[PDB]
From a paper:
The αβ-tubulin heterodimer is the building block of microtubules that, together with F-actin and intermediate filaments, constitute the cytoskeleton. Microtubule-targeting agents (MTAs) can be broadly divided into microtubule-stabilizing and -destabilizing agents. The maytansine site on tubulin has been discovered only very recently. It is a unique site on β-tubulin that is located at the longitudinal tubulin–tubulin interface in microtubules, which readily explains the microtubule-destabilizing effects of maytansine-site ligands. The maytansine site of β-tubulin is exposed at the plus-end of microtubules.
Intriguingly, spongistatin-1 readily displaced FcMaytansine from tubulin in a dose-dependent manner, revealing a Kd of 9.5 ± 1.9 nM (mean ± SEM; n = 3). To test whether the two compounds indeed bind to the maytansine site of tubulin, we used our T2R–TTL crystal system and solved the tubulin–spongistatin-1 and tubulin–disorazole Z complex structures to 2.4 and 2.1 Å resolution, respectively. The two complex structures revealed that both compounds indeed interact with the maytansine site on β-tubulin without inducing any significant conformational changes in the protein. Spongistatin-1 binds to the maytansine site by establishing a hydrophobic network between its cyclic core and the side chains of βAla397, βMet398, βAla403, βPhe404, βVal181 and βTrp407. Its side chain is buried in a pocket shaped by the side chains of residues βPro173, βPro175, βGlu183, βPro184 and βGln394, and by the main chain atoms of βSer178, βThr180 and βVal181. The tubulin–spongistatin complex is further stabilized by polar contacts formed between the main chain carbonyl group of βAsp179 and the hydroxyl group of the F ring and between the main chain NH group of βVal181 and the hydroxyl group of the B ring of spongistatin. Furthermore, a weak C-H hydrogen bond exists between C28H of the molecule and the main chain carbonyl group of βAla397. Notably, while disorazole Z binds to all three common pharmacophore acceptor points, Spongistatin-1 binds only to point II. Interestingly, spongistatin-1 establishes two distinct interactions close to point II via a hydrophobic contact (denoted point IIC; mediated by βMet398) and a weak hydrogen bond (point IID; mediated by βAla397), thereby defining an additional binding mode that is not observed for any of the other four maytansine-site ligands.
Numbering used by the authors:
A (entry chain A): 1 to 438
B (entry chain F): 1 to 102, 125 to 362, 371 to 379
C (entry chain B): 1 to 42, 45 to 277, 282 to 360, 369 to 438
D (entry chain E): 6 to 28, 44 to 74
Write the structure that this text describes.
C-alpha cells in the first residue's frame, strides 16, 4: 500500500479541498469525528482507503493533506467547520497578508518567507509513509497565491522528492466569477515556471462549471459552493481508483502512463454526466448509452472547446453505478459511427474503462440528485489548446501597452520574465498545432 | 441595437450585407478588433473560431462554418467523397478524380488511365490546383505524361480529373457553359437554395480537337472577358439567367429547367451538406454559424448534372447582389437577431 | 490586511471626514457613544477595518483629526458623533495657513507634522495587519492641500510598503474662496501623482451643479455638497467594510484599477439622486449611475475612454438582473471602454443598503476624460502666472519661481499622458 | 473491437477496448533567483528613500 499526500493552496484550492474531503468521508463511511465503524483493524491496516487516511490508536482516520493560504480567512472556516475534528493544527498553515492577485508577490516577496515552513510540515506526513508515491496539488490560475506560491512549491518538491509524481487540479479563470483584471498574467507566469515540474494537470474552467450549474441544475446565479460541490464529484471520479479496490489507475504513475505520451502536453480534458437537479422530483434514469454519448457534448466538458477539430492521444472512461462491460462496449460501438473521433496516427484508437459498482455519493441536501450510474471521461485532445489561445490573446492585448506591469517589477520581477513566459506558451501552442492539425 | 465587426474588406457580398444592416438603424458597426460583437463577418484565412462564444451576455454568430473547408478545397473534396460511406466513392454525380502530390494516388491514377487507354475510351484529363486563381494553373491533355510533368513543376498539390468531353452546348454558338447556384446554410442547418442561378458561358465555339486554346474550354469570367474575342456577343457579360435558359430548354429540348437539371442540383447539394453535418453543426455549440456557398455544376449532353467544385467565399452576379443580400439578412441574421412575401429560397429537407 | 488608518486635514477635510463617520457608524449599528445596537451579524464581521475595540465592547474610530487652526475641529467635537472620536487623536495648532500652500507645506505645517506622525505611529503599532491610510482634504486651501501633501510624503518615508489613498476636493471658480486656489491645487497634484496609490477626485463644480439642476436646490450650501460626498464615500468603501469577494482591500483594489502608476485619479458616481419613496428598478439604477449627471468630477465621460471601472450595488435585489444590466451597459457603449484591457468592469453586491434607500449603486471610474479637470486648473494657473500675479504670498514663505514652473510642467505632462492613452 | 485485460473484483471491474491500432534546477539556483529578486526590491526602495531625503 502506497500513500498519497494532497496539498491545497489559496482560496480556490482550500475551498475545493474542503468539498472533496467531505465527499470522501461520505463515500468511505467516516463520521465527521474521524471514527469509522466499518474499519475493523483498529489503529492500523493497509487497505485501499489507507492511501488517503492514516490511523491513530484511538481509531481516528486522518486525511493525508496540507492546507496553505497566505491569509487566514478561508482556512479558519476549516478549523471551525463540520470536519474540524478531522485534521490537526500542523496540517493547516496560514500567513497574515496575501499576494493581492500578484504572481510576483506570491512567488518572490511572500513565498520566500513561508516555503521552508510548508516543506517541513509536508516532510512530517512523508515520514509517516511506508511508500509515498506523490502529491496532488489544488490551486487557481488567477490568484496571487494559487499561481505564485504554487509554482515555487513545485520547484522545491522536485528537488526534495525527485522521484515522486505530481498531479495538478487547476482552476482556469472566467470573467463571470473572477476577481481580478490581471488573471491572464498570473495564469501564464505560473504555467511557465510550473510546466516542467508537473506530470499531469486537470484544468477546470469556471465558465464551464458556471453554465452547467445554470443549465442542468437550474441555479439562477451559481455560487462557489454550487461550483465546488460539482467540482468535487468530478475530482472524486478521478481519485476513486486510488481509494478503492480496482485495477486501473491504481497509482499516480499510471495517470502519466495512460494519459500523457508527451510530457509538455499533459492537460487532459474532463467530461462528466449526468448532472441532474435534485428538486426535479420525477426524472427518468439515463442508460449507459445515454450517459456515454453525453461525454461527447461540449456542454458537459470542464473546458468549452470543440474536440471535433482536434485529435485524441488517449481516452479513459470511469463509471460508477450499475454498469457492466457489455453495455459499455455496445454504447461505444454506436458512438463511433455517429461522432468525429480522430486519434493521432501514432496512437491506438481505443479506450481504457474502469467500473466501480458503488454509485455516486451526493452530499445530503445538495443540488445534485442521486443517480443509478454516472461516468467521467478523461481525454487528451489537442482541442484544449483553444483555452491557451484565449488566454494568450488577453495577455497580448495588455502587455503591448505594459498595462499593470509595474506592479510585478515593483516586487522584484524583471520585465524579461514576462516575454520569457509568453515565448514558452507560444511554443506550447505550436506543439499542439503540430500534433493535431494537418 | 445589435453590433457587428468586419474582418474581410475584400468581400463584395458582405460589403453589401454590411450596408443593409446599417440602413436598418438597428445595427452598429464596431472597430474590427472589438470583441463585444453580436455578428462577425470574418476573415478568409485563420479565422479565430477558438475565441468565439466566450463573451458573457452576448449571443455570437459568424458567417463561416469551422471545418467546411473539407468541402471547399479541391484536394480535400476528393478525399471527402472517396472515404465517406454516405457518399460511397461511387456516387454518380462526381467525376473520377485522383489526388497527386509533386497520401498520394499516383499509382491508382495510372491504372485507370491504362484501362481507358486499352479500352479506347475518351482519355482527356484536366489537372488543377487550389492556388489556381483566375484562369492560371490548369492543363487539359489526353496524355498522362504531360499532366504529371506539369504537376512536378509546381510545388503545390494537384488533382487529376476526367475532362467532361461531351458537354451540353448552347445554340447558336456551339458553346460551353457552367451553372452557379448560391446556397445558404443557417444556424439550424436549414438548407436554402437561392431561386436565381446564373450560367457563365464561353463566347467561343467548343473545339474538341485543340485543348491548348483554353478559351472555349474554360468558362471563367476572367478568361472570357480577356482572351475571347467574342465577349458579350450573345448575352450581356457571358451570363445567361434562369428565365432565358428555361425558355430555351422548352424551345429546343421540350423540357423545363426544374425537371431536367434542378432535381439533380437539389439532390447534390443535400448529399454534400448532410454528409458533413455531424462534423460542423453548431446546434449545441457555444457560438453559431451560417455560411453562403457557391456550387459549380456541369451539364452533359444527356442532361445529367455533374458537380465541379464548391466555393466557400463566393461572389455574386452584378444584377443579383441586391435581392440575395437582403435574403441573407432576413434568413440568416434577423432570424437570430430579430428586428422591430414569398421567399426567394427553396428549403431542402 | 484588515486595519485602515484614517486621517482628515483642514476645514474641508474635517467637515467631510466627520459626515463620513456619522454615515458609516449608522450602517454598522454603532451609536454616538461607541456602543453597538445592531441586529445583524454582517454589521460586526469587518468592523475592525475602521474601528478599534475598547473595554466594555466599545468601538472607537481609527481616525486622526488635523488642522492648523482650532475652529473647525471644535465644531466636530461638538457635532452629532463628536464624542465617539479618541480625544488624543485631535492634533492642531493656532496660526492657520491663510489659504497658502507654502504655509501648510514648508513653514506652519512643518512645525506641527511631527506630532501628527506620533499619533499615526501609535495607531499603526497596535494593528494586527495594517492595510494603509486614507486621507480626506481639499486642494484649494493651505492646510489640507499643503500640510496634507507633506503628511503623505512623510508617511510614505516611514511606511513605504503600505497603500496610500485620498479623497481630494478640487476647486472651482463657481464655488470659490480665494483667487489663489489654482496655485494651491497645481502644487498639490504634483505631490499626489508621486505619493498616492488611489485618489478620488471630487470636483466642487459637479457637486454644485447636481444640487442646483438635479436636486432642485436654488441656493446650495457646503452642507448640501457634503451630503453628496458622504453618500459617495460610504459607497466606495462598502467593499472594504462588509464581507465580499471583489476589491475587498486597498491593494487588490489598486491592482484592479491602476494600470500605470501615475494614472490613479478616479471619477466617482452615485445613484439615485432625487429631490423619495418610489422603488428604483435595477435597470434604473444602472442607467443613472453611468450618466454624467451623476458624476462627481465635472468631466464628460463621452469625451474620453474608461481604463477600468468598479461598480457596487447595495440592497436586496436580483443578482441575475444586476449581471444582465451591467453587461448591457458595456455591450451597448463599447466605444467608451479601452479594448486593450479585457473585462475591465467589475461588479460587487452587498445585501445591506444605505440608510433611507431600498437599493443604491456606486460607480468608480478610471477615465481619460479626467484630463479635462487638470486642463481647467492648468488654464486658471497660467492666466495668473504669466503676469506673476499673487506670487508674493508664496515668495515671502521662501518659495522660488522655478518651483511653480516645475509644478506646471508636471501637470501638463499628466494631461499629455492621459491624451496618450485616449488615442492608443 | 477487441476487449483485453479484464480484471474483476468484489467492488468492480476494468478492461480495455481497442478499435484500431496505430499508423531540474538545483536548490542553490532557486535560492539565487529568489535572492536576486529581493536585491532588486531593496535597490528600488533605497532609491525612493534617497529621493525622499532630497
Ligand atoms: N471554482 C472555484 N473558483 C474559485 C474559488 N475561489 C476562488 N476561485 C477563483 O480563483 C481565482 C482567484 O484566485 P484565488 O484562489 O481566490 O486567489 P488566492 O490563491 O487566494 O491568492 P491571493 O491573490 O493571495 O488572494 C478567480 O478566478 C476565482 O474565480 C472557489 O472556491 N471555487
Ligand atoms: N472535369 C471537368 N470537365 C470539364 N470541364 C471542366 C472540368 N473541370 C473544370 N472544367 C472547366 O474549367 C474550369 C476550371 O475552373 P476551376 O474548376 O478551377 O474553378 P476555379 O477555382 O478556377 C474558379 P471558381 O472558384 O469560380 O470555381 C471550370 O469553370 C469549367 O468550365
Ligand atoms: N465640498 C466642500 N468643499 C469645501 C468645504 N470647505 C471648504 N471647501 C473648499 O475647500 C477649498 C480649500 O479650503 P479649505 O479646505 O477650507 O482650507 P484649509 O483649511 O487650509 O485646508 C476651497 O476650494 C473651498 O471651496 C466643504 O465643507 N465642502
Ligand atoms: Ca484499519
Ligand atoms: Ca511658529
Ligand atoms: Mg486569497
Ligand atoms: Mg476556386
Ligand atoms: Mg476655508
Amino acid at each position: 500500500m502506497r500513500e498519497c499526500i494532497s496539498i491545497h493552496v489559496g482560496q480556490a484550492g482550500v475551498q475545493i479541498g474542503n468539498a472533496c474531503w467531505e465527499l470522501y468521508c461520505l463515500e468511505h463511511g467516516i463520521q465527521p469525528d474521524g471514527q469509522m465503524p466499518s474499519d475493523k483493524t483498529i489503529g492500523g491496516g493497509d487497505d485501499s482507503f489507507n492511501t488517503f487516511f492514516s490511523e491513530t490508536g484511538a481509531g481516528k482516520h486522518v486525511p493525508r493533506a496540507v492546507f496553505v493560504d497566505l491569509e487566514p480567512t478561508v482556512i479558519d472556516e476549516v478549523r471551525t467547520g463540520t470536519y474540524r475534528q478531522l485534521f490537526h493544527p500542523e496540517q493547516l498553515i496560514t500567513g497574515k497578508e496575501d499576494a493581492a492577485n500578484n504572481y510576483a508577490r506570491g512567488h518572490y516577496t511572500i513565498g520566500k518567507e513561508i516555503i521552508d515552513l510548508v516543506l517541513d510540515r509536508i516532510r512530517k506526513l512523508a515520514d509517516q509513509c511506508t511508500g509515498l508515491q506523490g502529491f496532488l496539488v489544488f490551486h487557481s490560475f488567477g490568484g496571487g497565491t494559487g499561481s505564485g506560491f504554487t509554482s515555487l512549491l513545485m520547484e522545491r518538491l522536485s528537488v526534495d522528492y525527485g522521484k515522486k509524481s505530481k498531479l495538478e487540479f487547476s482552476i482556469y479563470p472566467a470573467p463571470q466569477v473572477s476577481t481580478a483584471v490581471v488573471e491572464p498574467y498570473n495564469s501564464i507566469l505560473t504555467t511557465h515556471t510550473t510546466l516542467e515540474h508537473s506530470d499531469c494537470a486537470f484544468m477546470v474552467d469556471n465558465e464551464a462549471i458556471y453554465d452547467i450549474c445554470r443549465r442542468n441544475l437550474d441555479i439562477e446565479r451559481p455560487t462557489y459552493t454550487n461550483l465546488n460541490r460539482l467540482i468535487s464529484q468530478i475530482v472524486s471520479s478521478i481519485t476513486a481508483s486510488l481509494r478503492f479496490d480496482g485495477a486501473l489507475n491504481v497509482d499516480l504513475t499510471e495517470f502519466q502512463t495512460n494519459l500523457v505520451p508527451y510530457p509538455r502536453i499533459h492537460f487532459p480534458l474532463a467530461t462528466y454526466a449526468p448532472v441532474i437537479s435534485a428538486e426535479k422530483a420525477y426524472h427518468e434514469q439515463l442508460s449507459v448509452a445515454e450517459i456515454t454519448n453525453a461525454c461527447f457534448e461540449p456542454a458537459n466538458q470542464m473546458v468549452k472547446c470543440d474536440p471535433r477539430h482536434g485529435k485524441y492521444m488517449a481516452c479513459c472512461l470511469l463509471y460508477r453505478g450499475d454498469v457492466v462491460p457489455k453495455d459499455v462496449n455496445a454504447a461505444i460501438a454506436t458512438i463511433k459511427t455517429k461522432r468525429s473521433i480522430q486519434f493521432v496516427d501514432w496512437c491506438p484508437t481505443g479506450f481504457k474503462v474502469g467500473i466501480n459498482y458503488q454509485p455516486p455519493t451526493v452530499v445530503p441536501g445538495g443540488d445534485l440528485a442521486k443517480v443509478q450510474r454516472a461516468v467521467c471521461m478523461l481525454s487528451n485532445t489537442t482541442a484544449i489548446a483553444e483555452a491557451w489561445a484565449r488566454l494568450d490573446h488577453k495577455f497580448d492585448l495588455m502587455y503591448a501597452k505594459r498595462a499593470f506591469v509595474h506592479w510585478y517589477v515593483g516586487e522584484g520581477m524583471e520585465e524579461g520574465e514576462f516575454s520569457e513566459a509568453r515565448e514558452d506558451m507560444a511554443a506550447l501552442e505550436k506543439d499542439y498545432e503540430e500534433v493535431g492539425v494537418d | 441595437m445589435y453590433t457587428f465587426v468586419v474582418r474581410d474588406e475584400n468581400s463584395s457580398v458582405y460589403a453589401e450585407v454590411s450596408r443593409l444592416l446599417l440602413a436598418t438603424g438597428q445595427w452598429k458597426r464596431l472597430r474590427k478588433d472589438n470583441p463585444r460583437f453580436n455578428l462577425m463577418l470574418g476573415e478568409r484565412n485563420r479565422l479565430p473560431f477558438g475565441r468565439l462564444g466566450h463573451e458573457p451576455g452576448l449571443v455570437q454568430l459568424v458567417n463561416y462554418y469551422r471545418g467546411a473547408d473539407k468541402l471547399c478545397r479541391k484536394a480535400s473534396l476528393v478525399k471527402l467523397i472517396k472515404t465517406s460511406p454516405e457518399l460511397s466513392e461511387s456516387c454518380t454525380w462526381f467525376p473520377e478524380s485522383y489526388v497527386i502530390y509533386p497520401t498520394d494516388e499516383r499509382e491508382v491514377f495510372l491504372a485507370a488511365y491504362n484501362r481507358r487507354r486499352e479500352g479506347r475510351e475518351g482519355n482527356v484529363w484536366i489537372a488543377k490546383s487550389s492556388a489556381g486563381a483566375k484562369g492560371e494553373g490548369i492543363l487539359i491533355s489526353s496524355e498522362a505524361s504531360e499532366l504529371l510533368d506539369f504537376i512536378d513543376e509546381q510545388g503545390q498539390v494537384h488533382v487529376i480529373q476526367k475532362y467532361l468531353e461531351k458537354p451540353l452546348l448552347l445554340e447558336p454558338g456551339h458553346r460551353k457553359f457552367d451553372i452557379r447556384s448560391w446556397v445558404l446554410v443557417d444556424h439550424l442547418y436549414n438548407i436554402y437554395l437561392y431561386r436565381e442561378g446564373v450560367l457563365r458561358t464561353s463566347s467561343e465555339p467548343y473545339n474538341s480537337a485543340n485543348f491548348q486554346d483554353k478559351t472555349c474550354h474554360l468558362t471563367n469570367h476572367c478568361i472570357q472577358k480577356e482572351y475571347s474575342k467574342n465577349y458579350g456577343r450573345y448575352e450581356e457579360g457571358n451570363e445567361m439567367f434562369f428565365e432565358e435558359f428555361n425558355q430555351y430548354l422548352m424551345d429546343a429540348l421540350n423540357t423545363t429547367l426544374e425537371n431536367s437539371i434542378l432535381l439533380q442540383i437539389k439532390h447534390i447539394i443535400r448529399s454534400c451538406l448532410m454528409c458533413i453535418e455531424p462534423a460542423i453543426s453548431t446546434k449545441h455549440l457555444h457560438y453559431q454559424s451560417f455560411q453562403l456557398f457557391g456550387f459549380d455544376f456541369m451539364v452533359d449532353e444527356e442532361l445529367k448534372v455533374w458537380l465541379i467544385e464548391v466555393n466557400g467565399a463566393p461572389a455574386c452576379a452584378q444584377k443579383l447582389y441586391a435581392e440575395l443580400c437582403q435574403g441573407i439578412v432576413d434568413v440568416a441574421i434577423s432570424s437570430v437577431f430579430p428586428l422591430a412575401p414569398t421567399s426567394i429560397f427553396i428549403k431542402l429537407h | 490586511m484588515r486595519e485602515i488608518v484614517h486621517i482628515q486635514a483642514g476645514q474641508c477635510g474635517n467637515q467631510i471626514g466627520a459626515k463620513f463617520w456619522e454615515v458609516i457608524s449608522d450602517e454598522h449599528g454603532i451609536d454616538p457613544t461607541g456602543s453597538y445596537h445592531g441586529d445583524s451579524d454582517l454589521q460586526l464581521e469587518r468592523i475592525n477595518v475602521y474601528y478599534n475595540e475598547a473595554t466594555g465592547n466599545k468601538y472607537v474610530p481609527r481616525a486622526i483629526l488635523v488642522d492648523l487652526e482650532p475652529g473647525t475641529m471644535d465644531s466636530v467635537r461638538s457635532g452629532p458623533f463628536g464624542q465617539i472620536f479618541r480625544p488624543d487623536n485631535f492634533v492642531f495648532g493656532q496660526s492657520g495657513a491663510g489659504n497658502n500652500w507654502a504655509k501648510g507645506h514648508y513653514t506652519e505645517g512643518a512645525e506641527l507634522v511631527d506630532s501628527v506622525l506620533d499619533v499615526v505611529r501609535k495607531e499603526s503599532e497596535s494593528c494586527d495587519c495594517l492595510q494603509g491610510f486614507q486621507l480626506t482634504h481639499s486642494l484649494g486651501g493651505g492646510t489640507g492641500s499643503g500640510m496634507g501633501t507633506l503628511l503623505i510624503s512623510k508617511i510614505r518615508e516611514e511606511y513605504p510598503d503600505r497603500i496610500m489613498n485620498t479623497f481630494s476636493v478640487m476647486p472651482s471658480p463657481k464655488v470659490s474662496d480665494t483667487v489663489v486656489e489654482p496655485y494651491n491645487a497645481t502644487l498639490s497634484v504634483h505631490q499626489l501623482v508621486e505619493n498616492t496609490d488611489e485618489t478620488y477626485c471630487i470636483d466642487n463644480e459637479a457637486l454644485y451643479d447636481i444640487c442646483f439642476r438635479t436636486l432642485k436646490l436654488t441656493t446650495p450650501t457646503y452642507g448640501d455638497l457634503n451630503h453628496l460626498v458622504s453618500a459617495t464615500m460610504s459607497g466606495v468603501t462598502t467593499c472594504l467594510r462588509f464581507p465580499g469577494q471583489l476589491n475587498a482591500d486597498l491593494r487588490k483594489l489598486a491592482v484592479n484599477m491602476v494600470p500605470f502608476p501615475r494614472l490613479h485619479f478616479f471619477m466617482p458616481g452615485f445613484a439615485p439622486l432625487t429631490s423619495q419613496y418610489r422603488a428604483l428598478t435595477v435597470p434604473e439604477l444602472t442607467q443613472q449611475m453611468f450618466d454624467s449627471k451623476n458624476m462627481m468630477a465635472a468631466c464628460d465621460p463621452r469625451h474620453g475612454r474608461y481604463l477600468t471601472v468598479a461598480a457596487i450595488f447595495r440592497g436586496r435585489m436580483s443578482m441575475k438582473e444586476v449581471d444582465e444590466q451591467m453587461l448591457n451597459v458595456q455591450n451597448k457603449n463599447s466605444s467608451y471602454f479601452v479594448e486593450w484591457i479585457p473585462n475591465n468592469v467589475k461588479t460587487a453586491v452587498c445585501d445591506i443598503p444605505p440608510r433611507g434607500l431600498k437599493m443604491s449603486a456606486t460607480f468608480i471610474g478610471n477615465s481619460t476624460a479626467i484630463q479635462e479637470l487638470f486642463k481647467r486648473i492648468s488654464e486658471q494657473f497660467t492666466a495668473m502666472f504669466r503676469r506673476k500675479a499673487f506670487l508674493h504670498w508664496y515668495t515671502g514663505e521662501g518659495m522660488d519661481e522655478m518651483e511653480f514652473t516645475e509644478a506646471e510642467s508636471n501637470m501638463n505632462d499628466l494631461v499629455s499622458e492621459y491624451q496618450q492613452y485616449q488615442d492608443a | 473491437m477487441e476487449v483485453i485485460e479484464l480484471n474483476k473484483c468484489t467492488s468492480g471491474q476494468s478492461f480495455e477496448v481497442i478499435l484500431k491500432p496505430p499508423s531540474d534546477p538545483s536548490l542553490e539556483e532557486i535560492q539565487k533567483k529568489l535572492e536576486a529578486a529581493e536585491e532588486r526590491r531593496k535597490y528600488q526602495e533605497a532609491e525612493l528613500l534617497k529621493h525622499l531625503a532630497e
